[PDB]
Design an enzyme around this catalytic site. Structure first.
Site, PDB file in Angstrom:
ATOM      1  N   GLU A 258       0.820  -1.212   0.000  1.00 33.61           N
ATOM      2  CA  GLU A 258       0.000   0.000   0.000  1.00 33.61           C
ATOM      3  C   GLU A 258       0.855   1.263   0.000  1.00 33.61           C
ATOM      4  OE1 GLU A 258      -3.025   0.363  -0.558  1.00 33.61           O
ATOM      5  OE2 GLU A 258      -3.988  -1.585  -0.131  1.00 33.61           O
TER       6      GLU A 258
ATOM      7  N   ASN B 209      -7.873   9.098  -5.558  1.00 31.77           N
ATOM      8  CA  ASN B 209      -8.705   8.127  -6.254  1.00 31.77           C
ATOM      9  C   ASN B 209      -9.590   8.836  -7.274  1.00 31.77           C
ATOM     10  OD1 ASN B 209      -9.145   6.874  -2.963  1.00 31.77           O
ATOM     11  ND2 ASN B 209      -7.758   6.010  -4.506  1.00 31.77           N
TER      12      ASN B 209
ATOM     13  N   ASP C 120     -12.696   8.778  -7.728  1.00 33.34           N
ATOM     14  CA  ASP C 120     -13.944   9.311  -7.197  1.00 33.34           C
ATOM     15  C   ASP C 120     -13.759  10.588  -6.384  1.00 33.34           C
ATOM     16  OD1 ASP C 120     -12.934   8.445  -4.749  1.00 33.34           O
ATOM     17  OD2 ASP C 120     -14.487   6.955  -4.391  1.00 33.34           O
TER      18      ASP C 120
ATOM     19  N   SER D 155     -11.881  10.948  -3.645  1.00 32.44           N
ATOM     20  CA  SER D 155     -11.322  10.646  -2.345  1.00 32.44           C
ATOM     21  C   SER D 155      -9.808  10.478  -2.467  1.00 32.44           C
ATOM     22  CB  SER D 155     -11.964   9.380  -1.788  1.00 32.44           C
ATOM     23  OG  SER D 155     -11.614   8.236  -2.541  1.00 32.44           O
TER      24      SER D 155
ATOM     25  N   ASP E 115      -6.378   8.351  -0.417  1.00 34.73           N
ATOM     26  CA  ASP E 115      -5.903   7.338   0.523  1.00 34.73           C
ATOM     27  C   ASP E 115      -4.683   7.869   1.264  1.00 34.73           C
ATOM     28  OD1 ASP E 115      -7.812   5.604  -0.516  1.00 34.73           O
ATOM     29  OD2 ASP E 115      -6.355   4.361  -1.569  1.00 34.73           O
TER      30      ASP E 115
ATOM     31  N   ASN F 242      -8.928   5.377   3.219  1.00 33.47           N
ATOM     32  CA  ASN F 242      -9.614   6.208   2.240  1.00 33.47           C
ATOM     33  C   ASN F 242     -10.559   7.211   2.900  1.00 33.47           C
ATOM     34  OD1 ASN F 242     -12.220   6.458   0.297  1.00 33.47           O
ATOM     35  ND2 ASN F 242     -10.345   6.273  -0.921  1.00 33.47           N
TER      36      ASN F 242
ATOM     37  N   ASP G 271     -15.299  -4.729   9.834  1.00 36.43           N
ATOM     38  CA  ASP G 271     -16.576  -4.231   9.324  1.00 36.43           C
ATOM     39  C   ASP G 271     -17.331  -5.218   8.442  1.00 36.43           C
ATOM     40  OD1 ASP G 271     -15.582  -4.216   6.740  1.00 36.43           O
ATOM     41  OD2 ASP G 271     -15.530  -2.030   6.542  1.00 36.43           O
TER      42      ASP G 271
END
Length: 129
Positions: free
Chosen positions: A35, A46, A48, A50, A52, A59, A101
């Site tokens: 990562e 990203n 969209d 957003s 990271d 994110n 989650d």
């Protein structure tokens, strides 16, 4: 801060990630390697809108607030900049929420594609733990 491999393994273990939700320490080290290359300051935008952040590339669409991701939920209740600190506490605490989650470590694309199903304990071998 750019961690060494064994240095990060030790910090992750101290912060409770070894076998957290059944994921051995090597899984976490492998995820961080692919990562962020072990660099707490890593950021990536990203498609969209957003971004990271940090050693586990958490994110801003769901997990932290960066002030520029419309509709963000900030589920870790932290500024995304906290995920860039040399102190990994905030990244670890948020990662624990993420991995709990429902989808486990599949939340991390690099883990799915480069760590899952491999000899992840290689990432902690030779380390004083």
């Amino acid at each position: 801060k750019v961690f060494g491999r064994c240095e990060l393994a030790a910090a992750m273990k101290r912060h409770g990630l070894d076998n957290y939700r059944g994921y051995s320490l090597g899984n976490w080290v492998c995820a961080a390697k692919f990562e962020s290359n072990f660099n707490t300051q890593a950021t990536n935008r990203n498609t969209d809108g957003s971004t990271d952040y940090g050693i586990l590339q958490i994110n801003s669409r769901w997990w932290c607030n960066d002030g520029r991701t419309p509709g963000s939920r900030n589920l870790c209740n932290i500024p995304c900049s906290a995920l860039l600190s040399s102190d990994i506490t905030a990244s670890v605490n948020c990662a624990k929420k993420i991995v709990s989650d429902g989808n486990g470590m599949n939340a991390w694309v690099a883990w799915r594609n480069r760590c899952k199903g491999t000899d992840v304990q290689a990432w902690i071998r030779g380390c004083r733990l």
